[PDB]
Write an enzyme that holds these catalytic residues in place. Structure first.
Site, mmCIF file in Angstrom:
data_model
loop_
_atom_site.group_PDB
_atom_site.id
_atom_site.type_symbol
_atom_site.label_atom_id
_atom_site.label_comp_id
_atom_site.label_asym_id
_atom_site.label_seq_id
_atom_site.Cartn_x
_atom_site.Cartn_y
_atom_site.Cartn_z
ATOM 1 N N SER A 144 40.945 3.980 -46.564
ATOM 2 C CA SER A 144 40.238 2.939 -47.332
ATOM 3 C C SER A 144 41.085 2.290 -48.440
ATOM 4 O O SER A 144 40.626 2.197 -49.557
ATOM 5 C CB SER A 144 38.941 3.506 -47.931
ATOM 6 N N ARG A 159 49.383 -0.914 -51.846
ATOM 7 C CA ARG A 159 49.226 -0.619 -53.275
ATOM 8 C C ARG A 159 48.046 0.375 -53.277
ATOM 9 O O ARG A 159 47.123 0.250 -52.506
ATOM 10 C CB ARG A 159 48.795 -1.889 -54.052
ATOM 11 N N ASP A 197 38.124 0.666 -43.975
ATOM 12 C CA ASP A 197 36.654 0.862 -43.987
ATOM 13 C C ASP A 197 35.844 -0.428 -43.730
ATOM 14 O O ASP A 197 34.789 -0.351 -43.133
ATOM 15 C CB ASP A 197 36.201 1.667 -45.201
HETATM 16 O O1 LIG Z 1 36.485 0.932 -50.061
HETATM 17 C C1 LIG Z 1 36.384 -0.487 -50.353
HETATM 18 C C2 LIG Z 1 37.760 -1.170 -50.543
HETATM 19 O O2 LIG Z 1 38.298 -0.619 -51.746
HETATM 20 C C3 LIG Z 1 39.495 -1.263 -52.191
HETATM 21 O O3 LIG Z 1 39.252 -2.660 -52.320
HETATM 22 C C4 LIG Z 1 40.514 -0.971 -51.099
HETATM 23 O O4 LIG Z 1 41.798 -1.609 -51.499
HETATM 24 C C5 LIG Z 1 40.063 -1.533 -49.759
HETATM 25 O O5 LIG Z 1 41.014 -1.087 -48.728
HETATM 26 C C6 LIG Z 1 38.700 -0.930 -49.372
HETATM 27 O O6 LIG Z 1 38.211 -1.591 -48.209
#
Ligand SMILES: OC[C@H]1O[C@H](O)[C@H](O)[C@@H](O)[C@@H]1O
Ligand SMILES: [Cl-]
Ligand SMILES: [Cl-]
Ligand SMILES: [Cl-]
Ligand SMILES: [Cl-]
Length: 472
Positions: A144, A159, A197
């Site tokens: 995620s 990042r 995700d």
């Molecule tokens: O979990 C929700 C989101 O959190 C942050 O924005 C992460 O960078 C992204 O990858 C993810 O989809």
């Protein structure tokens, strides 16, 4: 409701904060215009601030997907491992275990992280397949965080977001990092795909709701996914293998939590400035820092500490516990909006018990107003990503599959988000369920969605079809 008892001196501060945090319908439309331009820039050859990362899902699930899969979900409060059984008529079943993250995982080493994850995978496989397996179990890994994918079973972390700060991972492909630890523990796992995700939310929700056009998270972070078309992805020109043609769908993890790090349109306040400057990655995730559940209690904490420093509230109090960054998570404003007492007895107990701060009735009305302002801003800003994707792709109607702790649990949030879309588009509709673009509860994207994407990927590979750029 009513504020008759609040002195004029404090009402002036409340009115200043209402002004500072209110987003007009016209302001949402102008943000949306600039958000569309930044989505398109991220797909361009030269790129842009918004990553717009292809996820190598090049088709829609039909509902006829069948079989048993593992999903590994990194990014909940706990690590989660799921056994997903796809039923082959838009149906599924699951069982899962949750594993508490090590203390200080977020500021620990790469080796700590991958060793902890493989340990949990082996516990799960040993529990559910105690007699062993004849062939490696296919797994989809929900990571995620933003990860560049030259092929679907690779993910190079761009990042850390949401407070993470693990040395040695940004700029590294995490799939081999996971695979080495799986091998060391001899776990019979085939990592078929890495997904975000959002991409899992999109695909799992399309499996049961054929009107799904986006999968969004409004939780610890804020982001969205949707399907574009390969012809509309300029940065893939000359990179694609022949079996993936110009008319192919392509799922995109937008990583639009990043939107407007240039600070050209969002209504950043001095509290948002401090949050960004004091975070592990200053300059990054501007839109998410204003909106997501990792940050909403920290916006309230900083406003409260400003009002204290300026002489308005908690005047006779020891406010030492209020000085700890992130000590007020989003459960604070949530409980405050839920308090059903006229004089906010629940809020009184919360501040006394957890922070050692005695409040007056008037101060609790101020605090409640502040929680409401912050939540309403979050909803009105967050749906600009939905409006932007829908306008960009020409969706006048859509089910927007939504998940995450703020959409699911923040008091009143679904109603405010639906009102904010109603206000953008000027609909006359009366009931939320009739909105032409409406947020609906998602299917489990990090579990069921990773399993469907593993299933679609394995079928592609058995068919000799591509799941990455040419030469992958
Ligand atoms: O979990 C929700 C989101 O959190 C942050 O924005 C992460 O960078 C992204 O990858 C993810 O989809
Ligand atoms: Cl006063
Ligand atoms: Cl990219
Ligand atoms: Cl300000
Ligand atoms: Cl439409």
């Amino acid at each position: 409701g009513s504020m008759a008892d609040v002195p004029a001196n404090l009402m002036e501060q409340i009115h200043g904060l209402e002004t500072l945090f209110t987003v007009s319908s016209e302001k949402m439309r102008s943000i949306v215009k600039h958000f569309i331009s930044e989505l398109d820039k991220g797909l361009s050859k030269k790129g842009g601030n918004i990553p717009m990362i292809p996820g190598w899902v090049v088709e829609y699930p039909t509902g006829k997907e069948t079989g048993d899969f593992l999903a590994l979900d990194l990014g909940g409060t706990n690590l989660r491992v799921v056994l997903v059984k796809l039923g082959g008529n838009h149906d599924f079943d699951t069982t899962q275990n949750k594993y508490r993250l090590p203390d200080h995982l977020r500021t620990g080493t790469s080796e700590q992280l991958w060793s902890f994850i493989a340990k949990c995978l082996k516990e799960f496989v040993d529990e559910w397949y105690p007699d062993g397996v004849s062939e490696p179990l296919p797994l989809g890994f929900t990571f995620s965080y933003p990860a560049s994918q030259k092929k679907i079973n690779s993910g190079v972390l761009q990042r850390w977001t949401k407070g993470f700060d693990i040395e040695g991972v940004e700029g590294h492909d995490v799939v081999p990092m996971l695979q080495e630890q799986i091998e060391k523990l001899n776990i019979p796992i085939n990592v078929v795909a890495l997904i975000n995700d959002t991409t899992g939310t999109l695909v799992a929700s399309l499996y049961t709701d054929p009107q799904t056009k986006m999968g969004i998270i409004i939780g610890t972070g804020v982001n969205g996914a949707y399907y574009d078309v390969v012809s509309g992805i300029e940065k893939l020109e000359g990179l694609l293998p022949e079996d993936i043609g110009p008319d192919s769908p392509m799922a995109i993890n937008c990583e639009y939590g990043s939107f407007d790090n240039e600070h050209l349109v969002l209504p950043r306040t001095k509290y948002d400035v401090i949050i960004d400057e004091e975070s592990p990655r200053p300059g990054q995730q501007a839109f998410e820092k204003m909106t997501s559940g990792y940050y909403l209690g920290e916006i309230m904490r900083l406003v409260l500490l400003d009002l204290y420093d300026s002489g308005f509230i908690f005047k006779d109090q020891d406010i030492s516990k209020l000085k700890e960054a992130y000590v007020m998570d989003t459960s604070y404003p949530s409980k405050i909006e839920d308090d059903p007492f006229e004089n906010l007895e629940d809020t009184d107990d919360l501040f006394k018990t957890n922070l050692n701060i005695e409040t007056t009735v008037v101060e609790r009305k101020l605090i409640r107003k502040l929680a409401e302002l912050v939540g309403t801003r979050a909803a009105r800003l967050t749906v600009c990503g939905v409006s932007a994707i829908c306008d960009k792709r020409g969706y006048k109607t859509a089910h927007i599959a939504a998940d995450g702790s703020v959409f699911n649990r923040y008091p009143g949030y679904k109603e405010k988000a639906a009102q904010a879309l109603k206000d953008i588009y000027n609909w006359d509709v009366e009931k939320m369920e009739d909105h032409p673009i409406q947020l609906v509860a998602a299917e489990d994207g990090s579990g069921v969605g990773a399993a469907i994407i593993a299933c679609l990927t394995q079928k592609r590979l058995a068919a000799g079809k591509s799941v990455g750029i040419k030469g992958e």
